[PDB]
Amino acid sequence: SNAKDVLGLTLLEKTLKERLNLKDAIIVSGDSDQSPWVKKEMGRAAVACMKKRFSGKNIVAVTGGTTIEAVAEMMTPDSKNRELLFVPARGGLGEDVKNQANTICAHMAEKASGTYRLLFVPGQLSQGAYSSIIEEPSVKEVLNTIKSASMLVHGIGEAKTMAQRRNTPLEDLKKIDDNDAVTEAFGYYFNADGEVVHKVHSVGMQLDDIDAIPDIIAVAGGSSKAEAIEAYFKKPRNTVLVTDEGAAKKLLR
Amino acid sequence: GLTLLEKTLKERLNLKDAIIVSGDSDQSPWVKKEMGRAAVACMKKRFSGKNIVAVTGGTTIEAVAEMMTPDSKNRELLFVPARGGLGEDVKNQANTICAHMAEKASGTYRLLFVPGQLSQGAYSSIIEEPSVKEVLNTIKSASMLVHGIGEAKTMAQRRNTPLEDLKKIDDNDAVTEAFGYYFNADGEVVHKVHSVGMQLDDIDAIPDIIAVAGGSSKAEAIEAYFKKPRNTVLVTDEGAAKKLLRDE
Numbered sequence: 001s002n003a004k005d006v007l008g009l010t011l012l013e014k015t016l017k018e019r020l021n022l023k024d025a026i027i028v029s030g031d032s033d034q035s036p037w038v039k040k041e042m043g044r045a046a047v048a049c050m051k052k053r054f055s056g057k058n059i060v061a062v063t064g065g066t067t068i069e070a071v072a073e074m075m076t077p078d079s080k081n082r083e084l085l086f087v088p089a090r091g092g093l094g095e096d097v098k099n100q101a102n103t104i105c106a107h108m109a110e111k112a113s114g115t116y117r118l119l120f121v122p123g124q125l126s127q128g129a130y131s132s133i134i135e136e137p138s139v140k141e142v143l144n145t146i147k148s149a150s151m152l153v154h155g156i157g158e159a160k161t162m163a164q165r166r167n168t169p170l171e172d173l174k175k176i177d178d179n180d181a182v183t184e185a186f187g188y189y190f191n192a193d194g195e196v197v198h199k200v201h202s203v204g205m206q207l208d209d210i211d212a213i214p215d216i217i218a219v220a221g222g223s224s225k226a227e228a229i230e231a232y233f234k235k236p237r238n239t240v241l242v243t244d245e246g247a248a249k250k251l252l253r
Numbered sequence: 254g255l256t257l258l259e260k261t262l263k264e265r266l267n268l269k270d271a272i273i274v275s276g277d278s279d280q281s282p283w284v285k286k287e288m289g290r291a292a293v294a295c296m297k298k299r300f301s302g303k304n305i306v307a308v309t310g311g312t313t314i315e316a317v318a319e320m321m322t323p324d325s326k327n328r329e330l331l332f333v334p335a336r337g338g339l340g341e342d343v344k345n346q347a348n349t350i351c352a353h354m355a356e357k358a359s360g361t362y363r364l365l366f367v368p369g370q371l372s373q374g375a376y377s378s379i380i381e382e383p384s385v386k387e388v389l390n391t392i393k394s395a396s397m398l399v400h401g402i403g404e405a406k407t408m409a410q411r412r413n414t415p416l417e418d419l420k421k422i423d424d425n426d427a428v429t430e431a432f433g434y435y436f437n438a439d440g441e442v443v444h445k446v447h448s449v450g451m452q453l454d455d456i457d458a459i460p461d462i463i464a465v466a467g468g469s470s471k472a473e474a475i476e477a478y479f480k481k482p483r484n485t486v487l488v489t490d491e492g493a494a495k496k497l498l499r500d501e
């Protein structure tokens with residue numbers, strides 16, 4: 001791309017991909033921590049990435065957070081009219097409703113002119129209540145759909161920021177801090193070496209399940225996220241990262 | 254102050270206040286948007302420093318949401334649905350209207366996530382859980398309610414009312430509906446949709462209630478709902494008001 005070439009993004013993408021061993025790196029100009037439109041541009045870039053990767057039939061698992069909400073906001077109908085079903089990856093993870101995967105999922109599906117199926121399993125159910133709810137045919141059906149996701153679109157967060165944003169019990173805050181968590185993705189907190197140090201108790205997709213998902217797109221940027229993004233990608237994730245100059249330049253510095 | 258039509262409607266229906274926009278929303282669809290605009294202005298006049306606003310679904314309150322704008326006074330705004338599922342399709346559900354209105358207001362919101370395809374047993378489990386109780390408690394503390402009014406038969410059909418309940422609604426001569434309750438011509442409850450959240454007895458404690466409903470087809474339904482004292486502000490149109498008052 002001549003735009004990417006003149007802006008130095010082509011080189012920055014190659015350098016970032018090599019540094020993090022990514023399947024691919026897509027970087028938009030600017031720093032989303034400073035300039036609001038940059039998050040929207042990450043959203044647009046992620047949508048392009050998704051459309052390039054869709055097949056004839058698609059089950060797209062999505063996480064919540066403001067970044068995947070920006071992907072949803074930038075989503076448009078498929079000109080090839082391929083079959084699109086959107087589901088949340090997990091149960092919502094203690095996010096307020098605006099930031100929950102169900103909310104992002106519904107928004108994305110409407111914008112894509114696709115269909116969606118939501119997962120309603122509250123995070124603080126008693127053992128007994130949980131046992132009954134997961135046997136419910138409607139819950140089983142959504143969980144089974146998630147098990148066959150062909151695509152995952154997910155955010156990445158700094159550990160402390162995420163622990164604070166969600167309704168994280170004191171007991172869990174202590175564990176997150178004691179084990180030096182630096183980054184978070186889809187209900188897992190990781191340390192600087194990309195090892196899992198704390199897991200949010202949820203339903204749906206688990207970390208081991210991503211290996212079976214052919215197309216995974218992480219969308220996260222802003223200089224504040226540089227260490228979080230680096231830590232997450234310490235492990236093989238077979239993932240395309242959509243990010244911005246803010247995060248990428250800080251990471252590479 | 255009030256026009257003679259507004260003054261007459263306020264007296265006739267024992268309203269806290271009447272706001273009547275021009276035209277008949279059953280003939281001129283955009284008039285629903287003008288009811289929405291007037292309702293938003295009314296809400297803004299009644300806000301305190303901190304607010305918990307319970308809202309119903311339906312196209313009229315969706316129009317309120319569409320016309321909502323942020324508060325120039327920057328008052329604290331938390332929106333919630335009044336009740337759980339009432340059997341509306343997604344576009345007409347209180348949860349949908351609630352999220353839309355909150356976004357337009359730059360406020361915050363909480364949703365109720367109840368019945369759906371779930372068993373009674375699984376349903377009861379959900380309503381016991383901490384976050385769900387929190388929303389129910391928030392609704393219980395509402396400082397404002399913004400609700401629609403519909404014709405009973407129309408509303409029963411739009412929702413997916415079981416045949417046995419359709420028969421009961423008909424047999425008891427329901428004529429009007431609001432927030433999941435069906436009322437006869439004397440404004441007495443004759444059938445209720447089962448749903449968590451706000452109950453009819455709870456409206457008395459809510460300081461500001463704004464009903465938004467118009468169109469000549471709703472004149473009978475509006476009159477009947479207000480046959481009992483509701484201490485409510487009605488935002489309506491000339492279509493409804495003139496027909497109700499026999500002034501056209």
Ligand SMILES: O=P(O)(O)OC[C@H]1O[C@](O)(CO)[C@@H](O)[C@@H]1O
Pocket residue numbers: 063064065066067068092093095099154155156157158162184185186187
């Ligand atoms: O895009 P944001 O707003 O930074 O949030 C990202 C976070 O949201 C989630 O995707 C959902 O909780 C987290 O896994 C991730 O840490």
Ligand SMILES: O=P(O)(O)OC[C@H]1O[C@](O)(CO)[C@@H](O)[C@@H]1O
Pocket residue numbers: 309310311312313314339341345400401402403404408430431432433
């Ligand atoms: O504004 P509409 O579309 O006529 O619907 C009014 C109806 O919508 C609801 O508020 C929601 O179901 C009902 O209580 C009310 O009767």
